[PDB]
Coordinates of C-alpha atoms and ligand atoms in Angstrom, one line a residue:
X1 CA 0.0 0.0 0.0
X2 CA 0.9 3.5 -0.9
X3 CA 2.7 6.1 1.3
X4 CA -0.1 8.6 1.8
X5 CA -1.3 6.0 4.4
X6 CA 1.5 7.3 6.7
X7 CA 0.1 10.8 6.7
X8 CA -0.6 12.4 10.1
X9 CA -2.6 15.6 9.9
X10 CA -1.5 18.8 11.7
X11 CA -3.8 21.5 13.1
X12 CA -2.9 25.0 14.6
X13 CA -4.5 26.6 17.5
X14 CA -5.9 30.0 16.9
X15 CA -5.0 32.8 19.2
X16 CA -6.9 33.1 22.5
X17 CA -9.4 35.8 22.4
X18 CA -9.9 35.8 18.5
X19 CA -13.5 36.4 19.5
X20 CA -13.3 38.6 22.5
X21 CA -15.3 38.7 25.7
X22 CA -17.7 41.0 24.2
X23 CA -18.7 38.4 21.7
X24 CA -17.0 40.3 18.9
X25 CA -14.9 38.8 16.2
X26 CA -12.1 41.3 16.5
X27 CA -9.9 41.4 13.5
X28 CA -11.0 39.2 10.6
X29 CA -8.6 40.9 8.3
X30 CA -5.7 40.1 10.3
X31 CA -6.6 36.6 11.0
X32 CA -7.3 36.1 7.5
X33 CA -3.8 37.0 6.3
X34 CA -2.5 34.6 9.0
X35 CA -4.8 31.7 8.0
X36 CA -3.7 32.2 4.4
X37 CA -0.1 31.6 5.5
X38 CA -1.1 28.3 7.2
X39 CA -3.0 27.1 4.0
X40 CA 0.1 27.8 2.0
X41 CA 2.3 25.8 4.5
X42 CA 0.2 22.8 4.1
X43 CA -1.6 22.9 7.4
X44 CA -4.8 20.7 7.5
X45 CA -7.0 22.7 10.0
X46 CA -7.1 24.9 13.1
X47 CA -8.4 24.6 16.6
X48 CA -10.5 27.1 18.5
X49 CA -12.2 27.5 22.0
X50 CA -15.9 28.1 21.8
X51 CA -16.1 29.9 25.1
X52 CA -19.1 29.1 27.2
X53 CA -18.6 32.3 29.1
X54 CA -18.8 34.4 26.0
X55 CA -21.8 32.6 24.4
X56 CA -24.2 32.1 27.2
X57 CA -23.2 35.3 28.9
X58 CA -26.5 37.1 29.2
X59 CA -28.6 34.6 31.1
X60 CA -29.6 30.9 30.9
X61 CA -30.2 29.8 27.4
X62 CA -29.3 33.2 26.0
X63 CA -26.9 32.1 23.4
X64 CA -25.4 34.4 20.9
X65 CA -23.6 32.4 18.2
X66 CA -23.1 35.2 15.8
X67 CA -19.5 36.1 16.1
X68 CA -18.4 32.4 15.9
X69 CA -20.5 32.0 12.7
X70 CA -18.4 34.7 11.1
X71 CA -15.1 33.1 12.3
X72 CA -16.2 29.7 11.1
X73 CA -17.1 31.3 7.7
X74 CA -13.6 32.9 7.3
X75 CA -12.0 29.5 8.3
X76 CA -14.0 27.7 5.6
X77 CA -13.0 30.5 3.0
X78 CA -9.4 29.8 3.8
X79 CA -9.5 26.2 2.9
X80 CA -8.9 24.9 6.5
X81 CA -10.9 22.4 8.6
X82 CA -11.8 23.1 12.2
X83 CA -11.5 21.4 15.7
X84 CA -14.0 23.0 18.0
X85 CA -13.6 22.9 21.8
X86 CA -16.7 23.2 23.9
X87 CA -14.8 25.3 26.4
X88 CA -16.8 25.3 29.6
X89 CA -13.9 26.6 31.7
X90 CA -12.3 29.9 32.4
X91 CA -9.4 31.4 30.4
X92 CA -6.8 33.2 32.4
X93 CA -5.2 31.3 35.4
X94 CA -3.2 28.7 33.4
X95 CA 0.1 28.7 31.6
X96 CA 0.1 31.0 28.6
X97 CA -3.3 32.5 29.3
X98 CA -3.1 36.1 28.1
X99 CA -6.7 36.9 28.1
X100 CA -9.2 36.6 30.8
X101 CA -12.5 34.9 29.9
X102 CA -14.6 33.8 32.8
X103 CA -17.5 31.4 33.0
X104 CA -20.9 33.0 32.7
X105 CA -21.8 35.9 35.0
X106 CA -25.1 34.4 35.9
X107 CA -23.4 31.3 37.1
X108 CA -20.8 33.3 39.0
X109 CA -23.7 35.0 40.6
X110 CA -25.1 31.9 41.9
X111 CA -21.7 31.0 43.3
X112 CA -21.7 34.2 45.2
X113 CA -24.3 32.6 47.2
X114 CA -23.4 28.8 47.0
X115 CA -19.7 28.9 47.1
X116 CA -19.6 25.1 46.9
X117 CA -20.2 25.1 43.2
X118 CA -16.4 25.5 42.8
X119 CA -13.5 23.2 43.2
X120 CA -12.2 23.8 46.9
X121 CA -8.9 23.0 48.5
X122 CA -8.3 21.9 52.1
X123 CA -7.8 25.6 53.0
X124 CA -11.2 26.5 51.6
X125 CA -10.0 28.5 48.6
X126 CA -12.6 28.5 45.9
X127 CA -11.3 28.1 42.4
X128 CA -13.8 29.7 40.0
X129 CA -12.4 28.4 36.7
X130 CA -14.8 25.4 36.4
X131 CA -17.7 24.0 38.1
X132 CA -17.1 21.1 40.5
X133 CA -18.0 17.5 39.5
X134 CA -19.8 17.7 42.9
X135 CA -22.6 19.5 41.1
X136 CA -22.9 17.5 37.7
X137 CA -26.3 16.5 38.8
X138 CA -27.5 19.1 41.3
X139 CA -30.5 21.0 40.0
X140 CA -29.4 24.3 41.4
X141 CA -28.6 26.4 38.3
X142 CA -32.1 28.0 37.8
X143 CA -33.6 24.6 37.7
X144 CA -30.8 22.9 35.6
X145 CA -27.9 20.7 36.7
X146 CA -24.4 21.5 35.4
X147 CA -24.5 18.5 33.0
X148 CA -27.8 19.8 31.6
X149 CA -26.2 23.2 31.0
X150 CA -23.4 21.6 29.0
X151 CA -25.8 19.3 27.1
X152 CA -28.1 22.3 26.2
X153 CA -25.1 24.2 25.1
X154 CA -23.9 21.5 22.7
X155 CA -27.4 20.9 21.3
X156 CA -27.6 24.7 20.6
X157 CA -24.2 24.6 19.0
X158 CA -25.3 21.7 16.8
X159 CA -28.5 23.3 15.6
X160 CA -27.0 26.7 15.0
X161 CA -24.0 25.5 13.2
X162 CA -25.7 22.7 11.2
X163 CA -24.7 24.2 7.8
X164 CA -21.0 24.2 8.8
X165 CA -21.3 20.8 10.2
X166 CA -23.1 19.4 7.3
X167 CA -20.5 21.0 5.0
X168 CA -17.7 19.1 6.6
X169 CA -15.9 22.2 8.1
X170 CA -15.8 20.8 11.7
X171 CA -13.8 17.7 12.0
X172 CA -13.8 17.0 15.7
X173 CA -15.6 18.3 18.8
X174 CA -13.3 18.4 21.7
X175 CA -15.6 18.2 24.9
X176 CA -14.2 20.4 27.7
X177 CA -14.3 18.5 31.0
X178 CA -12.2 20.5 33.4
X179 CA -9.7 23.4 33.8
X180 CA -7.9 24.3 30.6
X181 CA -10.7 22.0 29.1
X182 CA -8.8 18.9 30.3
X183 CA -10.4 16.0 32.2
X184 CA -8.6 16.7 35.6
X185 CA -8.9 18.5 39.0
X186 CA -7.3 22.0 39.1
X187 CA -4.6 20.7 41.4
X188 CA -1.8 23.0 40.1
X189 CA -3.4 26.4 40.0
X190 CA -1.0 29.2 39.1
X191 CA -3.5 31.5 40.5
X192 CA -2.9 30.1 44.0
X193 CA 0.8 30.2 43.9
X194 CA 1.4 26.8 42.5
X195 CA 4.9 26.6 40.9
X196 CA 6.3 24.0 38.4
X197 CA 7.9 21.0 40.1
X198 CA 5.2 21.4 42.7
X199 CA 3.1 18.4 43.9
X200 CA -0.3 20.3 43.8
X201 CA -3.3 19.7 46.1
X202 CA -6.3 17.5 46.1
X203 CA -9.4 19.4 45.2
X204 CA -12.3 17.5 46.9
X205 CA -13.2 19.8 49.7
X206 CA -16.4 21.5 48.3
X207 CA -19.5 20.5 50.3
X208 CA -20.8 18.0 47.7
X209 CA -17.8 16.1 47.1
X210 CA -17.1 15.9 50.8
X211 CA -20.6 14.6 51.7
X212 CA -20.3 12.1 48.9
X213 CA -17.0 10.9 50.2
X214 CA -18.4 10.6 53.8
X215 CA -21.3 8.5 52.7
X216 CA -19.1 6.3 50.6
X217 CA -16.6 5.5 53.5
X218 CA -19.6 4.8 55.7
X219 CA -20.9 2.2 53.3
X220 CA -17.4 0.7 53.1
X221 CA -17.4 0.3 56.8
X222 CA -15.3 3.3 58.0
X223 CA -17.6 6.2 58.6
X224 CA -14.7 7.5 60.6
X225 CA -12.5 8.0 57.6
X226 CA -11.9 11.5 56.6
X227 CA -10.5 13.4 53.6
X228 CA -6.7 13.6 53.4
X229 CA -5.2 15.8 55.9
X230 CA -1.6 15.0 55.6
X231 CA -1.0 15.8 51.8
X232 CA 0.9 19.0 52.2
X233 CA 0.6 22.1 50.0
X234 CA 0.8 23.1 46.3
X235 CA 4.6 23.4 46.3
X236 CA 5.7 20.5 48.6
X237 CA 7.7 17.7 47.4
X238 CA 6.3 14.3 48.2
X239 CA 8.9 13.0 50.7
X240 CA 8.0 16.0 52.7
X241 CA 4.4 14.8 53.3
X242 CA 2.7 12.1 55.3
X243 CA 0.4 11.1 52.4
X244 CA 3.0 10.7 49.7
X245 CA 6.2 9.6 51.7
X246 CA 7.2 6.0 51.4
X247 CA 4.9 3.8 53.4
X248 CA 2.7 6.9 53.7
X249 CA -1.0 7.1 53.7
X250 CA -1.4 6.7 49.9
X251 CA -0.6 2.9 50.3
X252 CA -3.0 2.4 53.2
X253 CA -6.6 0.9 52.9
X254 CA -7.9 4.4 53.4
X255 CA -5.6 6.2 51.0
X256 CA -6.4 3.6 48.4
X257 CA -9.9 3.9 49.0
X258 CA -9.8 7.8 48.8
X259 CA -7.7 7.6 45.7
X260 CA -10.0 5.3 43.9
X261 CA -12.9 7.4 44.9
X262 CA -11.3 10.6 43.8
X263 CA -10.1 9.3 40.3
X264 CA -13.4 7.5 39.7
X265 CA -15.3 10.9 40.0
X266 CA -13.5 12.0 37.0
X267 CA -14.1 8.8 35.0
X268 CA -17.7 9.2 35.8
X269 CA -17.8 12.9 35.0
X270 CA -16.3 12.3 31.6
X271 CA -18.6 9.4 30.8
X272 CA -21.9 11.2 31.6
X273 CA -21.0 14.3 29.7
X274 CA -19.7 12.4 26.6
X275 CA -23.0 10.7 26.8
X276 CA -24.7 14.1 26.3
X277 CA -22.3 15.0 23.6
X278 CA -23.0 12.0 21.7
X279 CA -26.6 12.6 21.8
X280 CA -26.2 16.2 20.8
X281 CA -24.0 15.4 17.6
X282 CA -25.6 12.2 16.8
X283 CA -25.6 11.7 13.0
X284 CA -23.2 14.6 12.4
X285 CA -20.0 13.8 10.5
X286 CA -17.6 14.6 13.4
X287 CA -15.5 12.7 16.0
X288 CA -15.7 13.5 19.7
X289 CA -12.4 13.9 21.6
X290 CA -11.3 14.7 25.2
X291 CA -8.2 16.2 26.5
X292 CA -6.0 14.5 29.1
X293 CA -3.2 16.5 30.7
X294 CA 0.4 15.2 30.5
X295 CA 1.6 15.5 34.2
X296 CA 5.2 14.2 33.8
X297 CA 6.6 15.6 37.1
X298 CA 7.1 13.0 39.9
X299 CA 6.4 10.4 37.3
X300 CA 9.7 8.8 38.1
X301 CA 9.0 8.4 41.9
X302 CA 6.9 5.6 43.2
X303 CA 4.2 8.0 44.5
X304 CA 3.4 9.8 41.2
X305 CA 2.2 12.6 43.5
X306 CA 1.3 15.3 40.8
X307 CA -0.6 12.7 38.8
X308 CA -2.5 11.6 41.9
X309 CA -3.6 15.0 43.0
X310 CA -4.7 15.9 39.4
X311 CA -7.1 12.7 39.6
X312 CA -5.0 10.4 37.5
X313 CA -4.6 7.3 39.9
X314 CA -1.5 6.2 38.1
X315 CA 1.3 4.2 39.9
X316 CA 4.0 1.8 38.8
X317 CA 1.6 -1.0 39.5
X318 CA -1.7 0.5 38.5
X319 CA -2.3 1.9 35.1
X320 CA -4.5 5.0 35.7
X321 CA -4.9 6.1 32.0
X322 CA -5.9 2.9 30.4
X323 CA -9.2 3.1 32.1
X324 CA -9.9 6.5 30.6
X325 CA -9.2 5.1 27.2
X326 CA -11.5 2.1 27.7
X327 CA -14.2 4.6 28.8
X328 CA -13.6 6.6 25.6
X329 CA -14.1 3.4 23.6
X330 CA -17.9 3.3 24.1
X331 CA -18.2 6.7 22.8
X332 CA -15.9 6.1 19.9
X333 CA -13.9 9.1 21.1
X334 CA -10.4 10.3 20.6
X335 CA -8.0 10.8 23.5
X336 CA -6.2 14.0 23.0
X337 CA -3.0 13.9 25.0
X338 CA -2.0 17.4 25.7
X339 CA 1.9 17.2 26.1
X340 CA 3.9 15.5 23.4
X341 CA 7.1 17.5 22.8
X342 CA 9.3 17.3 25.8
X343 CA 12.4 15.2 26.3
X344 CA 13.4 13.8 29.8
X345 CA 16.6 15.6 29.7
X346 CA 15.0 19.0 29.3
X347 CA 13.7 18.7 32.8
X348 CA 15.3 20.0 36.1
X349 CA 16.6 16.9 37.7
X350 CA 14.7 17.7 40.9
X351 CA 11.4 17.2 39.2
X352 CA 11.8 13.4 38.8
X353 CA 10.2 14.0 35.4
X354 CA 9.5 11.3 33.0
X355 CA 7.7 13.0 30.0
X356 CA 8.9 10.4 27.3
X357 CA 7.8 7.4 29.4
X358 CA 4.5 9.0 30.4
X359 CA 3.8 9.4 26.6
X360 CA 4.6 5.8 25.8
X361 CA 2.4 4.7 28.6
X362 CA -0.6 6.8 27.6
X363 CA -0.5 6.3 23.7
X364 CA 0.2 2.5 24.1
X365 CA -2.7 2.2 26.5
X366 CA -4.9 3.9 23.9
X367 CA -3.8 1.8 21.0
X368 CA -4.1 -1.2 23.1
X369 CA -7.8 -0.4 23.9
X370 CA -8.2 0.4 20.1
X371 CA -9.2 4.0 20.3
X372 CA -7.8 6.9 18.3
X373 CA -5.0 9.0 20.0
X374 CA -4.1 12.6 19.3
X375 CA -2.1 15.2 21.1
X376 CA -0.6 18.7 21.5
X377 CA 2.6 20.4 22.5
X378 CA 2.4 21.7 26.0
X379 CA 4.6 24.7 25.6
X380 CA 5.6 27.0 22.7
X381 CA 8.4 25.6 20.8
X382 CA 10.0 26.5 17.5
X383 CA 13.1 24.2 17.2
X384 CA 13.8 21.1 15.3
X385 CA 14.2 19.4 18.6
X386 CA 10.6 19.9 19.7
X387 CA 9.4 19.1 16.2
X388 CA 11.4 15.9 15.9
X389 CA 10.1 14.6 19.2
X390 CA 6.4 15.2 18.1
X391 CA 7.1 13.4 14.8
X392 CA 8.5 10.4 16.7
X393 CA 5.4 10.2 19.0
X394 CA 3.3 10.5 15.9
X395 CA 4.7 7.4 14.3
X396 CA 6.6 5.6 17.0
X397 CA 7.8 2.8 14.7
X398 CA 8.6 5.0 11.6
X399 CA 7.0 5.1 8.3
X400 CA 5.8 2.0 6.4
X401 CA 6.8 2.1 2.9
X402 CA 4.4 -0.6 1.9
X403 CA 1.3 0.0 3.9
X404 CA 0.0 2.1 6.7
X405 CA 2.3 2.3 9.8
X406 CA 1.4 -0.2 12.6
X407 CA 1.3 2.6 15.0
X408 CA 0.2 6.2 14.3
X409 CA -1.5 9.1 16.0
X410 CA -4.7 10.4 14.5
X411 CA -3.6 14.0 14.5
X412 CA -1.5 16.7 16.3
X413 CA -2.6 20.1 17.2
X414 CA 0.3 22.5 17.5
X415 CA 0.4 25.2 20.2
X416 CA -0.9 28.5 18.9
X417 CA -0.4 30.6 15.8
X418 CA 1.3 33.8 16.8
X419 CA 3.5 36.3 15.0
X420 CA 6.5 34.4 16.4
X421 CA 5.5 31.3 14.6
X422 CA 5.0 33.3 11.4
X423 CA 8.5 34.9 11.6
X424 CA 10.7 33.8 8.7
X425 CA 13.0 31.3 10.2
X426 CA 10.6 29.9 12.7
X427 CA 8.0 29.5 9.9
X428 CA 10.5 27.8 7.6
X429 CA 11.1 25.2 10.3
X430 CA 7.4 24.7 10.9
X431 CA 6.8 24.1 7.2
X432 CA 9.3 21.2 7.4
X433 CA 7.7 19.9 10.5
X434 CA 4.4 19.9 8.5
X435 CA 6.0 18.2 5.6
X436 CA 7.4 15.3 7.8
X437 CA 4.1 14.8 9.6
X438 CA 2.7 14.3 6.1
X439 CA 5.4 11.8 5.5
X440 CA 6.9 13.9 2.8
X441 CA 3.7 14.1 0.9
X442 CA 2.0 17.3 -0.2
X443 CA -1.0 18.5 1.7
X444 CA -3.9 16.2 1.0
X445 CA -7.3 17.8 1.0
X446 CA -9.4 14.6 1.1
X447 CA -8.8 12.6 4.2
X448 CA -10.3 9.6 2.8
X449 CA -7.1 9.2 0.8
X450 CA -5.3 8.7 4.1
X451 CA -7.8 6.6 5.8
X452 CA -9.4 9.3 7.8
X453 CA -12.9 9.4 6.3
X454 CA -15.5 10.9 8.6
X455 CA -18.7 9.2 9.1
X456 CA -21.8 10.1 10.8
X457 CA -21.5 9.8 14.7
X458 CA -23.2 6.7 16.0
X459 CA -24.8 6.3 19.3
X460 CA -22.5 5.3 22.1
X461 CA -22.2 1.8 23.0
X462 CA -23.6 0.6 26.2
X463 CA -22.4 1.8 29.7
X464 CA -19.3 -0.3 30.7
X465 CA -19.6 -0.9 34.5
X466 CA -16.9 0.6 36.7
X467 CA -15.4 -2.9 37.5
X468 CA -14.8 -3.4 34.0
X469 CA -13.3 0.0 33.4
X470 CA -11.0 -0.8 36.4
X471 CA -9.8 -4.0 34.9
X472 CA -7.8 -1.8 32.5
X473 CA -5.7 -0.8 35.5
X474 CA -3.6 -4.0 34.9
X475 CA -0.1 -2.7 33.8
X476 CA 1.1 -3.6 30.4
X477 CA 4.3 -3.2 28.6
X478 CA 4.3 -0.2 26.2
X479 CA 4.8 -0.7 22.5
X480 CA 8.4 -0.3 21.3
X481 CA 9.5 3.1 20.2
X482 CA 12.3 4.0 17.9
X483 CA 15.0 6.2 19.5
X484 CA 14.9 8.7 16.8
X485 CA 12.3 9.4 14.2
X486 CA 13.1 8.2 10.7
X487 CA 11.5 11.5 9.5
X488 CA 13.6 14.2 10.9
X489 CA 13.1 17.9 10.2
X490 CA 16.6 18.5 10.6
Ligands
LIG1 O1 -3.2 22.0 32.3 C1 -2.3 22.8 31.5 C2 -1.0 22.1 31.2 O2 -0.3 21.7 32.4 C3 0.9 21.0 32.3 O3 1.9 21.7 31.5 C4 3.1 22.1 32.4 C5 4.4 21.8 31.6 O4 4.4 20.5 31.3 C6 5.5 22.2 32.5 C7 5.4 23.6 33.2 O5 5.6 24.7 32.3 O6 4.1 23.8 33.7 C8 3.0 23.5 32.8 C9 1.8 23.6 33.6 O7 1.6 24.9 34.2 C10 0.7 19.8 31.3 O8 2.0 19.2 31.0 C11 -0.1 20.1 30.0 O9 -0.4 18.9 29.4 C12 -1.3 20.9 30.3 O10 -1.9 21.3 29.1
LIG2 O1 -6.8 27.0 23.3 C1 -6.8 25.7 23.8 C2 -6.4 25.6 25.3 O2 -5.1 26.2 25.4 C3 -4.6 26.5 26.7 O3 -4.6 25.2 27.3 C4 -3.7 24.3 26.6 C5 -2.2 24.4 27.0 O4 -1.7 25.7 27.1 C6 -1.3 23.6 26.1 C7 -1.7 22.2 26.2 O5 -1.2 21.6 25.1 O6 -3.1 22.0 26.3 C8 -4.0 22.8 27.0 C9 -5.4 22.5 26.5 O7 -5.3 22.5 25.1 C10 -5.6 27.3 27.6 O8 -5.2 27.4 28.9 C11 -6.9 26.6 27.5 O9 -7.8 27.3 28.4 C12 -7.4 26.5 26.1 O10 -8.8 25.9 26.1

């Protein structure tokens, strides 16, 4: 079989704020000259936040889709496809966030009087960037639950954008499930003083999560068990805590129990909302996708602290990503792994960082459960080094000259299209990165040629019970990676 079968598409995130808080598409002319450069480079499509807080600003079910319609139209004129994020989170407190976009005021307003709608840490600090899982099903938002708000929103988006959908502009709907749109707890909030190699904190202290946890321990036989109180603070290192030190609480019956409870809330949160998404886009030619954060720090210690606090119950003897993938399988969704570029040696030694190993684990787990895997770079990079790492992850075993590769990612969405990227030398490198993703082929407008035809979304398969999800915690050996890509940019 031909070469084109090796092709891996490349998408480019649009600038934050392209449609501003006031629901105004700010500078079409400018964007337009940018997009035209991307089309010339061979870029397949672009990715954009569809901010909940801009759209449903005025009041419940007061959507204004107008400015996004304009943007989508301009994208379509430029010959590019589009990845749309249902961004139900706030823009501002995370790395790179240059614009502030909060969640809806009417929701914020409720929170002034029910503070427990937000994620809360042990100290009682409310993080307003995303509604707590604790309220997925509480009918406190003027009669709706949070999951109903998201579901209504996606329905609305589907009806109002049906022409773009039916025209094949939109290729994938990325469903936002937490801060930065990722399925995770906001355990490393810059806005609270968290700093890089920092362990982060559990975020289950809001009233609803807490009561749920209390009732669950009581049913387990230990009504007396309580939420972790020996985990430390944002910037600790694990050895310095009772929870994460060796032989600490995390390996006790109660730590295990808490941990399982805490990581299960996410799996469940993701599964219920994807259920709604599936129903909203049923029949549309689009794939659904979720975003999983790459938390590589502490990966190389037995306690995987940062992962744990973010809600990924991953250890050396318990695969805590594979279960997410198996959950995605019923929805036929793509796991978008948000960190792909980093090399272990680029990390401060004191972080016990295992970015490359984390990647192999996560993509292997995906491929093993037979779902599609995509990903992004976590930080801005312009060098061949970044690029050649993303290319290797894309096709871990190199190109197949006589057939499709045995392993390949479904797509990669590069981190942001800025002036910097478009500067002459930077851009020249980019163009090569694009070319090698495409396996040296020219940009290929019909994805069916490279075995990416899109079909109408089917209904999810049936609910997989938690037990079964949790079987996927059995560790497996990763697939073998080459050491260097066979398609270097350099
Ligand atoms: O949730 C946002 C991102 O968080 C992590 O990115 C970190 C970098 O890996 C290292 C350092 O600069 O801090 C960043 C977080 O503030 C994660 O790696 C990404 O996948 C997430 O998108
Ligand atoms: O515009 C998409 C997403 O970008 C930022 O979050 C990114 C992160 O900076 C890079 C990493 O590869 O993935 C995260 C999610 O894509 C913004 O913070 C986030 O709010 C925005 O939705």
